[PDB]
Point group: C3
């Protein structure tokens, strides 16, 4: 059959028949830059054999059930750096490169960490020091760490279904492909809270990470990701990264594509504290900082979204609750990247576990499928004890 | 020789040496989407050949003379589904894919027919129901039928060589490649007449068919054309369709490319009332409605352009006069698609004739070349009697 | 080896690791059109190898030292049409196509010359005769010759580093890829000096050569260059030329890529007075007018930039002083094209010498390295006497 690839403008409203083919062919739809691999590839050898089962409603389900019910296109579970489980669906295979959506927020964050290690960014510096086009804007004075914590205080209307929202204006900037358009949008925004006091999920603010990384390194973010990680630990396959315009700027908040085992290798890099062959790519304590759960902080689990989301926020990572509030099997400081339509990159340092889930849910957010994904993941964590 | 391909901005002004090469290489100039063929092809067996000859001035002319005088790059005459004539010129061959200009208006309209047959669009419904971008403009309340009949009554200046004309504006929006630029222009236009009362040929109004089709099916129009026609009856070759923007929206009013016999197959589809292998693709009575001649209607042949044009208008088809006013050998309810610089798709149901003409006239409109084409086609209809 | 290619917006600010790869891969960064070669290639036979040496400070330097000191990617010296010196650096070889920056202004000027020979342009005619969208602008009444001499009198701010300059707006128009955007900028500019009295280096005015060439020939400028010179002389390889937009208009002031020996062939065309195989392409006396040094002219050597620059101007060519103020070895009427970061095309008719220099200086203009380039070229001239 011919590939069913949607219009560029319809990415967030494709019919189910068009999602898998578009999600794995984003380079046919948007401008992109190649994230090059190297010549050495980090091995992912076979590991513990598991057949995880979980209970929901009153019924028991295995892996094929999970994948059928949630329209899952890929599942990878790494234990101790070794493949415990690897499945493909929806026509995907080991060579498929699938798009990240907001999962790439956590990759950008980790690269900011690499830039901190090199001295090229500092958490404490104001964003306008690196990005002079923000001079005079509400972002002037906001720090890099405040951007990482979605706590700039700049007013941001994220609702996609409001034609007037900032997220829709940013998506139209992308579709227009005029370089610097998102930055100009961000520079127009008024301030609403004191900086550092208020969580507002902003896809534009997350994009600012990509802008900062380019400004600090003076090379394309895709090449920095390659030199710091993709070619250094050794991913198996090139990736690629959606840009704002041709040969332009990577979208910091969305649009990275990679093989399933390469998403897993990135997770394994984070699980291993950023160390590749004895050299520290990430600052000492970076992963602890980026996934920190502090009871008094306004980012703590339970405290976001009027109190009815369970997960907190770190440096562009969602943080699982700890202690009495923990979700079953996800205690000990688990954290994750997520993207709409059911993309997950789950890291459990206590258990040395990395999980990657690729999905094509009909709708961008579905609470029952998120909760099912966590039940399935917790059953895998339980079976790997 | 390497191909002589014009700048994208110059499509309506190319010098004669750049016209044939550009018209068969439009995918090297503009963004395009592929119209996929199937694996079965509807045959076009050879019939009894014809060598029609006709008189102009005091001179008699064959097909070769006609081809030379009108700078014809292709002519195809089908008689009851069989090839009575097939000639190529200007360096074209059987595999050449030549652009349609406004001939695609009639393809889009027929796809609207297919959507009516599937219950996805209705002639009496307003266009802004399907196209929210039109709500609050002078198109609000205009019905799908009135769009097909170029009778919205919205003020539209079609003249090309005036820089500030609406047609030039819409071409500028295509050349900018911003998704939705054409719809934004259309939404900015004032009402001039009550709708359903006055014919105004508008290339933007005709594009609305493309936008309506995607809004009702939620798949690219190229893919709807493929599933409904191009892969169902089986064209011999892929087509392609010019877009407003990279991976964007098909131009409903211009810019489809296909081989000469695939244009013939589409004419045959219409001639055969939109049935393929016993399946109805078009509503019963669609072709009749779409080529309607009613003396009372403002659309009747002889009323358009305040009497100075012999042809009337249907559902984006031009209608030939019937009765006493018939042009020689074109009685019985013949109708046609046409495009500037000499493109024709002529359908004579009485005679069971489909004819395709590809030309590269130096100017977009030459009355004398139009008249000579009707004289040649009439000679061909006569020869096939 | 994956090339280190910058963001399109960063061309004038790349870090050194990114300059050589980007300069030879501009077709991966901007829209381009191919400049096609022909079927025959004009040979550049081997001559007597020279090993020029010159003294800077108190030190002897040869070709290798020149090259390592000024980060030179290529050097070609032709004497009487024969290769006296040919060296590649920075990873380049005989098939590299390296970008020209402003060197192409002199190519555009020479094509205007070709159009004057064919009668399609005239030096004393106003540019708004050929570009009607400049009627009513500061260019109204400005002649073709005045544009050639950078002497339109239109007010123009070249400052790259000022974000509001006209050069920045031009480059923004380019990045936004909207057809005709540069001409729109040009038509917005106010009058400053009476036309043909003062020299103001204007990248936009130089781009105007390209717009004029297309208006007067009605074919893409790349194809005109091909038919007049590239395919006729016999270049060795295709070139290509940066555009304003995909399949759009060539940038008249920047962005041509060619192999080293093909730049040499173009210089040799100029040196042979614009005749190829007995077919005169440039008007008699064109090279004379285009490189004129006339002490009473506002363009004479020593008059530009309040007398702070040794070189005068001609038809988009820089002219070396003659007489008592001649640079050593550079007397007799030498002239050159130059481009930022160290690109030179030097033509010395008296000595029958053509020199091409390709460099990747860290900064656009470094006076020190320019002076050293002229001392090295002078040493070549001496060695070639
Ligand atoms: C990333 O995939 C997109 C953004 N990510 C989310 C998200 O967090 O799911 C939203 S915002 C919206 C707020 N309430 C929901 C939520 O937080 N959860 C279900 C956890 C989702 C964006 C669409 C980005 C590509 O725009
Ligand atoms: C399609 O080819 C272009 C439009 N088609 C015509 C046309 O051929 O009719 C016009 S302009 C004007 C309106 N009616 C005149 C006419 O009756 N004939 C040529 C027969 C010409 C447009 C330019 C479309 C791509 O704009
Ligand atoms: C060409 O490479 C760029 C333009 N070229 C020049 C140039 O000729 O160096 C400049 S402007 C600058 C102003 N005065 C300079 C000079 O020659 N001296 C100070 C001695 C020339 C442009 C940037 C083009 C790509 O824009
Ligand atoms: Mg196993
Ligand atoms: Mg019905
Ligand atoms: Mg020769
Ligand atoms: Zn850069
Ligand atoms: Zn309505
Ligand atoms: Zn769609
Ligand atoms: Zn043209």
């Amino acid at each position: 059959e011919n590939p069913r690839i949607g219009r560029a403008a319809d990415l967030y409203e494709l019919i189910p028949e068009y999602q898998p083919d578009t999600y794995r062919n984003m380079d046919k739809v948007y401008p992109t830059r190649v994230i090059h691999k190297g010549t050495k590839v980090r091995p992912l050898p076979a590991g513990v054999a598991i057949a995880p089962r979980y209970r929901i409603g009153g019924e028991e389900y295995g892996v094929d059930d999970f994948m059928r019910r949630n329209r899952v296109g890929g599942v990878l579970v790494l234990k101790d750096g070794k493949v415990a489980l690897e499945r493909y669906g929806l026509g995907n295979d080991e060579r498929t490169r699938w798009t990240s959506f907001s999962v790439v927020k956590s990759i950008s964050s980790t690269l900011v960490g690499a830039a901190v290690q090199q001295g090229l960014l500092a958490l404490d510096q104001p964003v306008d020091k690196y990005l002079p086009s923000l001079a005079g804007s509400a972002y002037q004075g906001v720090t890099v760490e405040q951007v990482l914590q979605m706590s700039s205080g700049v007013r941001w209307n994220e609702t996609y279904r409001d034609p007037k929202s900032d997220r829709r204006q940013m998506f139209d900037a992308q579709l227009a492909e005029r370089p610097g358009g998102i930055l100009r949008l961000l520079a127009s925004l008024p301030r609403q809270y004191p900086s550092g006091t208020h969580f507002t999920y902003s896809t534009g603010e997350s994009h600012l990470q990509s802008e900062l990384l380019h400004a600090a390194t003076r090379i394309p973010v895709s090449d920095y990701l390659s030199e710091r990680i993709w070619a250094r630990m050794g991913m198996e396959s090139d990736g690629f990264w959606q840009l704002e315009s041709p040969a332009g700027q990577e979208i910091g908040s969305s649009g990275l594509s990679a093989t399933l085992r390469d998403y897993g290798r990135f997770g394994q890099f984070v699980l291993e504290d950023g160390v590749i062959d004895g050299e520290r790519i990430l600052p000492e304590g970076w992963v602890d900082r980026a996934s920190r759960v502090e009871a008094s902080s306004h980012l703590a689990p339970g405290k976001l979204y009027d109190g009815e989301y369970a997960l907190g926020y770190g440096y562009q990572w969602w943080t699982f609750p700890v202690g009495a509030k923990a979700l079953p099997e996800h205690d000990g400081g688990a954290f994750e990247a997520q993207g709409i339509f059911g993309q997950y990159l789950y890291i459990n340092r206590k258990e040395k576990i990395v999980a990657v889930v690729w999905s094509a849910w009909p709708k961008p957010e579905m609470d029952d499928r998120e909760e099912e994904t966590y039940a399935f993941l917790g059953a895998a964590v339980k079976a790997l004890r």
